[PDB]
């Protein structure tokens, strides 16, 4: 979302496995919206069904 702010991959979203990241491009920092029914930090796990 808008190059200067974001443009992130999703299949490993730079930070997370199953995330949709705000790769703060100007900061070089990816941080994630975990996918529908997944859990977090590095969005590795499904919700409860890890």
Domains of the chain: 1-50 (2.10.25.10)
DSSP state of 16: -
Q: Each residue of 11-37: b (16+ CB within 10 Å) or e?
A: eebebbbbbebbbebeeeebebebbee
What is the rounded distance in angstroms from the CA atom of residue 11 to the CA atom of residue 20? 9
What is the rounded distance in angstroms from the CA atom of residue 1 to the CA atom of residue 41? 21
Method: NMR
């Amino acid at each position: 979302v808008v190059s200067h702010f974001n443009d992130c991959p999703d299949s490993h979203t730079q930070f997370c496995f199953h995330g949709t990241c705000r790769f703060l491009v100007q900061e070089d920092k990816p941080a994630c919206v975990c996918h529908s029914g997944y859990v977090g930090a590095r969005c590795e796990h499904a919700d409860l069904l890890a």
